[PDB]
Design a protein around this ligand. Sequence first.
Ligand SMILES: [Zn+2]
Ligand SMILES: [Zn+2]
Lengths: 796, 113, 72, 93
Amino acid sequence: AQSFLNRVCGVSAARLTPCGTGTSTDVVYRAFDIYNDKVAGFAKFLKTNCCRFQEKDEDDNLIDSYFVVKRHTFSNYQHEETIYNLLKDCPAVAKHDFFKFRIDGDMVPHISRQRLTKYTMADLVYALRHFDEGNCDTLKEILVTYNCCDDDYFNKKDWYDFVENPDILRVYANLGERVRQALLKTVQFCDAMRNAGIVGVLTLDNQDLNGNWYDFGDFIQTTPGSGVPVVDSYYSLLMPILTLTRALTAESHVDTDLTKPYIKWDLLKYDFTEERLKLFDRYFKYWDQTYHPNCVNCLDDRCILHCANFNVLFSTVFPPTSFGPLVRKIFVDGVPFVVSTGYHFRELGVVHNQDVNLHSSRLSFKELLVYAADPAMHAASGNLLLDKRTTCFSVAALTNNVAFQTVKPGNFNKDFYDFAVSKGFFKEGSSVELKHFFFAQDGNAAISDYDYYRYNLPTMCDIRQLLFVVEVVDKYFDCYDGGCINANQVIVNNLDKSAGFPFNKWGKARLYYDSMSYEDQDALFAYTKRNVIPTITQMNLKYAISAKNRARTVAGVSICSTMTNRQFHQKLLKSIAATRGATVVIGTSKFYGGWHNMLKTVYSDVENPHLMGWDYPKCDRAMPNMLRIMASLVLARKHTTCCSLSHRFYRLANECAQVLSEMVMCGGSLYVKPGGTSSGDATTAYANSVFNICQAVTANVNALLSTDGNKIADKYVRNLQHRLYECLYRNRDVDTDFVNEFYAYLRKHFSMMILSDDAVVCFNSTYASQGLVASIKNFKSVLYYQNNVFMSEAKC
Amino acid sequence: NNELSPVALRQMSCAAGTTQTACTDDNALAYYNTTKGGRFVLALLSDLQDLKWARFPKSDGTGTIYTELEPPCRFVTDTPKGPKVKYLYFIKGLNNLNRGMVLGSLAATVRLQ
Amino acid sequence: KMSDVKCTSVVLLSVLQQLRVESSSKLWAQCVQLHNDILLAKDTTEAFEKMVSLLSVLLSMQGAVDINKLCE
Amino acid sequence: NDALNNIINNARDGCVPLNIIPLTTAAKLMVVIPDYNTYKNTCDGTTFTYASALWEIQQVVDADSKIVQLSEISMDNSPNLAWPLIVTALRAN
Ligand SMILES: [Zn+2]
Ligand SMILES: [Zn+2]
């Protein structure tokens, strides 16, 4: 015992305190990334085989420095010894011992790994992904250990929620530089493994919170100079934490250190391609897939997503001013103009128009229509604005005064009220009581609603999981059909509706549909397939009854977007709205037995049926950018024939340019919308349906891979788990067979009925209890780490 | 316990050459991954110094696909014939995982020095 | 009885707005605060003191002849 | 048409992000302040700085669009004012 402790300390001469009684191991409960030929998954197990020794400091203080010793056979001892004395000089490598000790009466080899931390990054990842309000423990310990916060902070009410505690983002940000250091150190590990010829799979199980790597028990060696570290599961599982913890902030400072001031970029610099490649080289040097700084050069939709993810990460570095429309001066009839000619998307990069006309002669009706719609000229003519009422970037003010809008109290029908009271209603102790009213608002309503678009943050999504989710979701829209239509096939519900800021001043949408011919409409539609047209959406204060004093607003979008999204999603969506018996239920009436038919469809062959419902905290103002791009993409998938790739990409560019991050004029002033979605385009409800389906399926996958995988009984489900892991983190291409099988699995065991942001699911109880399908817990975890919102019990 | 590649990947002979139609008849040890959506080869092994083109007819036989290769990767292996110094090649676009599994299979199932 | 309270609060704020009290931003803000408080309240005693508080705003003006309007 | 020409002449190809056009060329600024405290930090005194430029005060109004003098905005006199205050300034040269 005493000699064992004296040997573990060895030449180090530390003050090892045996946090484990005698020469016995210490079984801990830690998360692992496992892939054998039997079981696969990222799940938390029980670890034997190690005895731990915390180091003591001078004044009997205990520091997070542990001497983990591993007991195993002789074969592994030799295997790790012969490959530890190959890469011993890499700073990313923890120092090993490789001794032998006379445990009991026989000789056993032990490998002493020295100076690790209590938790590896696997614990951090599993804690921040699979969160529980009442099972934090390890998250609290990590968060307090590294002087990010204090313990009395955890006594705060709803400390863990982003919405009503906007300080929790600051707390997580104090852990951020450690992850940057870990990546910056694992890059040299990869380089040394290359230089010395080692082949294997790096996992975030064997990397400490310092960044040191300490396990080689599954590795093989080859000729030096050609090593292939398989960084595929590692980066994929580590993605979300980088943007949740804001781990790249150091790049905003000069010389990459938080102490020094920020880098003062040139205001007129708009193309940051070189910096994007520089950061990608610095931090993800060994990521096999190619990277396109500008999403124009992508090969198809999947490469668009894969490049957009890294762009979303890197866009937190560059100044906020260099994002938006790109203006150029063009003379028409000798008159210099200021017209939009290109755009700088945070997620897509730089896109230049192809049909820009310089030194034109006359402006036809379509040219005047376009040059009067984009905010370029209105912005270049206005005066600079600075508003302290909100945090989101502001552009300018069109007028010389700021108009203030309010709401009216709503009128009272005393006749019906008296007739009701005379009928024994509205008395004391009644189960019926007035809970719906026409509330009023002050002169600050919309500006108090835009700080709800404040709640949206730059978000990365786990990219490989997201790609597979796109593939599986693509099947739920397989029975539908659509494609481009000419100007003669559009059908408009009501023509007496407003057009927008720079059009409402003169007429209504009837005037514009009936002034320009069909040929002009087709010309504009074809123009939008090789350019970008920024627009302005007006923000409007709704006037209706509600159960809570919230000033809900609506968005009146401009008319160019109306035509150029109608001519496309009209045929896409009229198929959806007229189809019965599908998961999407939009366009079906509840009357004439429709509601009963819906419910009978929901209960379609559910074995152990139970019902579950949820509601997202703020569906419209928190939806991360990537999921909206995904919705637009899976809606645009139905154009494999009618258009080429560049046309699809430009349509998506216009969609994200006038619905995602556009300029809203609220009270006579232009503000930039950080993200979210605008209710008032042609495709809000269906996009929200797509988002709901995506969240449900990703919750299902995250649930099924969180399971142990050894206690699982049915061989079919175990094979499903193994192949699902293989298809997520080990396949570069799509597998139609397995996605077919998996879609069949969910449709059999987990049935959904979806309308806009609201959902009803019938699910198998046994599978949920065994963790085979998603439950309320997994779904809440998914919302937490992919929407920056914590759902409570009052919404589910 | 993330194991590199359970189950081994076997080989089959194939044709390669330096350029255009230089694939003569049969010169390469193609290590191939059989998927029922079509046989998809991973690696090429040769005693020929510089082969950048490789050839394989499709299943129908009316077409014949060409594949491109990396710069040669040197190694030497011990066999009954003594030391044999060979070059392995990978098709461009090959992810790191396929390289990892093929090198694991080679370094486990083939003697090397 | 609180139903009558909420109904008369609604009508009172309606007449206050039609009296262009909204042209004083702070006054209208306070009146809106009081209205939103009354409709959301659950106890009757608090509603009475809030409604008399916001009615004092009406009675401080000189645009509504009370004595003629109180015809009984 | 004088200042904007200077900036656009300085671009590599002529393209400049739109958001800096009113940041460098606009000749007027208006600031909306929610309370006296934030007013102290930004628009204290008869002139202030922002966007690497010096701006001079000329006019202040409240939510009711009526004149209010710079002496009137004190800590004690503050609760007697509407507080989306509007202040306009001119680019000093
Ligand atoms: Zn790409
Ligand atoms: Zn098309």
